[PDB]
Write a structure and sequence with these properties.
Oligomer: heterotetramer
PDB class: signaling protein
Order of helices and strands of chain D: HHHHHHHHHHH
CATH class of chain D: Mainly Alpha
Structural class of chain D: mainly alpha
Strand content of chain C: under 5%
CATH architecture of chain C: Irregular
Number of domains of chain D: 1
Helix content of chain D: over 70%
Chain A: Guanine nucleotide-binding protein G(s) subunit alpha isoforms short
Largest sheet of chain C: none
CATH topology of chain C: G Protein Gi Gamma 2
Number of helices of chain D: 11
Largest interface: B-C, 57 and 37 residues
Structural class of chain C: mainly alpha
Helix content of chain C: 40-55%
Assembly: tetrameric
Largest sheet of chain D: none
Number of strands of chain D: 0
CATH architecture of chain D: Up-down Bundle
Entry title: CryoEM structure of beta-2-adrenergic receptor in complex with GTP-bound Gs heterotrimer (Class R)
Number of strands of chain C: 0
Number of domains of chain C: 1
Order of helices and strands of chain C: HH
Distance between the termini of chain C: 64 Å
Shape of chain D: globular
CATH superfamily of chain D: Rhodopsin 7-helix transmembrane proteins
CATH class of chain C: Few Secondary Structures
Shape of chain C: elongated
Bound molecules: guanosine-5'-triphosphate, the ligand CN[C@@H]1CCc2c(ccc(O)c2O)[C@H]1O
Radius of gyration of chain C: 23 Å
Radius of gyration of chain D: 21 Å
Keywords: GPCR, Adrenergic, Receptor, G protein, signaling protein
CATH topology of chain D: Rhopdopsin 7-helix transmembrane proteins
Chains: A alpha/beta, B mainly beta, C mainly alpha, D mainly alpha
Strand content of chain D: under 5%
CATH superfamily of chain C: Transducin (heterotrimeric G protein), gamma chain
Amino acid sequence: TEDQRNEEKAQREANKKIEKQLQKDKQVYRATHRLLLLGAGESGKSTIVKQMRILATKVQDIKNNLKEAIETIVAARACYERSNEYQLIDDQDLLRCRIFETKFQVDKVNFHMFDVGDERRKWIQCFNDVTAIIFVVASSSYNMVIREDNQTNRLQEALNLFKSIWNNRWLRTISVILFLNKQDLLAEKVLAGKSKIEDYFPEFARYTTPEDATPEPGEDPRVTRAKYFIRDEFLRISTASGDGRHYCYPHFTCAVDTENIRRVFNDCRDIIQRMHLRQYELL
Amino acid sequence: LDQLRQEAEQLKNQIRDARKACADATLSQITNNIDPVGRIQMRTRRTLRGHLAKIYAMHWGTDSRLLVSASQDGKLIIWDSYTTNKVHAIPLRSSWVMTCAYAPSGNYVACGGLDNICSIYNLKTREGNVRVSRELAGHTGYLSCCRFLDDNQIVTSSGDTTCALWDIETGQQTTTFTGHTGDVMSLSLAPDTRLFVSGACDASAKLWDVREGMCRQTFTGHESDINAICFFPNGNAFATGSDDATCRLFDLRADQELMTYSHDNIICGITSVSFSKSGRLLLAGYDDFNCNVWDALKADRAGVLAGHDNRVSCLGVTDDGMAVATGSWDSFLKIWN
Amino acid sequence: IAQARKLVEQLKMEANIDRIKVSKAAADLMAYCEAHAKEDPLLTPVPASENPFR
Amino acid sequence: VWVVGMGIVMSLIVLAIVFGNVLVITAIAKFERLQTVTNYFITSLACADLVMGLAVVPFGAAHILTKTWTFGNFWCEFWTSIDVLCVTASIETLCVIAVDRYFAITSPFKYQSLLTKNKARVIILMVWIVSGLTSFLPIQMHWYRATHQEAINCYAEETCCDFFTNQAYAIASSIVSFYVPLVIMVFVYSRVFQEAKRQLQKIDKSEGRFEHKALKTLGIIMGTFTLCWLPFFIVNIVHVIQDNLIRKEVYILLNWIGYVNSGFNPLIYCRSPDFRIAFQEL
Ligand SMILES: Nc1nc2c(ncn2[C@@H]2O[C@H](COP(=O)(O)OP(=O)(O)OP(=O)(O)O)[C@@H](O)[C@H]2O)c(=O)[nH]1
Ligand SMILES: CN[C@@H]1CCc2c(ccc(O)c2O)[C@H]1O
């Protein structure tokens, strides 16, 4: 037993020193909220991270992008008119140029944002303890097609993904925040007579502006109806199921301007408040 | 290209005829004489706590006394089953970890995850500080499993439908394995460390060669993604994990399916499988909050292990067959005997 | 068609292998299990005196 | 012989409180999933209610039925002190629970940092200490006793004892037990209801396509405690103002009515699906 008495003290020190350290780390892990970015290709995921991070080689990289853009235009002024037929890639200069984890703090609150990183989607089962999921789509790319198959509408492609994510067994108690990006491009495209929205979507012909709307005073009537049509389609899938454990928060934003005046913080506050308020038997 | 494609279909027809001609009778007919095992009930002996999040990986040591567990919290903790005392706590650069290993010599621990990089750590360091030794970074896709052949070799499997054999001294892939059309999720070496299998997501299992680097036998018929795989102690068989709550046992020499383990009341998935010392019990986890113990030669349930509050994501059996350890997603390790 | 050409040759190698009957493998597995069933603590419970975890 | 008929019901009522409190106390230790920072207050309340039901209900029922006391004057004083300590303990815990709910709902971000296991243990220990201090210290110091011919006669009597108190101690006990927590609880629940109504209104606006529950829950939670405890404290504070206004029989009846809150508490609280599943498991 003499040998054990000498040995036991060491295992006690290690268990102790380690146990005290792990107890301290619990507070850091508990007082941290994680966010996930999802969406379709060529949507603007990096630009949103760039805007949030705002709270040399890049110039050369932008120059390389300009050379590639010039070559693309050469292969295609009149060529830019038919830019919808063929695939084309679109502070202020930083956003224009084309696992990434970014940590930022707002109002003495620690937040964690990690990028997505592939149609198997098997890694999605790992993110089962995330506060919210950020889902980004392009609202001004209905007359476009994904490169891999030319038979599928770029926009319809995005929804087919939202329904799969929404109707997932693992993500049964995770809220979704919706960002309808590329709003500026939509306004210019709709004003032009060419490329009518009704041509691709037959349901827009019978659509009417909802009574409960709030168009910016500046915006023309035609645009508002169009804008609200995209949001209505997305919310139809979300409201189908959920049973009170799922909530979607649509928004309209342009990646160029910093309209994000702490709105992510406000939305996360509401989500956590609702989680607490429905955690009780009834409230 | 039609002639080449049609030639492939010609080969498949010959394989089926040869396999069918080599089926004298089913295994269940031969093994009907043996007596049933009965009812086996094991009680929890030790409970291991101290993890902050869900747990994905687990692996025993050569001494069958030390085990390592990996969790999404970013900590790699080495325990001590006999006295329930932590020995090390290695921090990780990436918070997403999906696998871990343990050296036969007990001097190195590996890790990997969504970072697409396999990391190796040193234990018996000079000056007593754990520290990254090598960072194998040339690869694509998230890793799934890692195993040690010796102190200088390691095999890895990832989601880019490829498997590779690494070299710690140079940090370069000595050889690469190709042929799978889906994500590779599990692997297991043979006791002779000369052959190893790998179950992909395309409902197929292959038996590779370490020295040659070419496929030898491709099994089939699972009908869903394989999520775990083990290997028989005798060295001539291996069982496969399943999405469809079905475990299938294959034979290398016969190149045929022997039995299928299933039950009517189960519709959940399978996460981990393992064998016993004598190759009689086929322990396996489940997605329905507990584990069930099967009979290798009878396909009859012989006990239920329901001491967990969440899904089971790992399982292991000691080399000497003394105890069974199972993890979960609720940050609790349990040791059964 | 280059990728398909390489895959065609692989299937030829797998075809030309030796095979045995299922009954022989079954007998070998049964013999191995019978031989090694004695030293299996999980099947036959060990005495509490020689139980490390008890 | 109506005493026999009434006595049977009293035995069943006393047993029900013990059975309900025992199940709640055992569940937290047996299953690791139920344990949390919030359940500590629930466990303390259940323990206090079980102690009350095991200690003061049987002795009081026996004294009422037999109409005589044989243990002695010291036992009567100890029983009165234990009863007042147990009553003071149960009410304070509910106010703490309401404060915890308000803290959680109002500031979710700072709730995790504001509440800790050590802080909860310190708070519950302080609540128990302040509950005990107002019970044993005044009673055992004999400053409880008032000056009256009936008072000295009862004190000299050995086989009978009754609850007669001075005005000052009655007012102090009522204020420290009932009146102080009630206003805080009402304000807390009003703020919670306002926040819930605002959140429900905000939720209604977002989806055009496709608060009875909250109102009902708040109503039952407040009303059970209010209806159970308000009349007794009202009549107790009215007793010292005028002696001839109220008799002892109605006082005893209202006191017995107030005792039933201990049995009602486990039914209204811990009604979550996890608690029900854990209870059904064993
Ligand atoms: N005009 C305009 N361009 C935008 C807007 N948002 C993003 N872009 C551009 O879109 C380009 C492509 O978006 P990125 O952010 O690079 O895409 P990503 O984040 O990699 O997302 P994926 O392509 O889906 O992986 C960027 O180079 C931006 O310049 C917007 O609101 N207006
Ligand atoms: C014997 N019953 C006692 C009498 C008076 C009294 C009680 C409880 C709390 C108080 O503050 C009291 O003044 C009752 O439990």
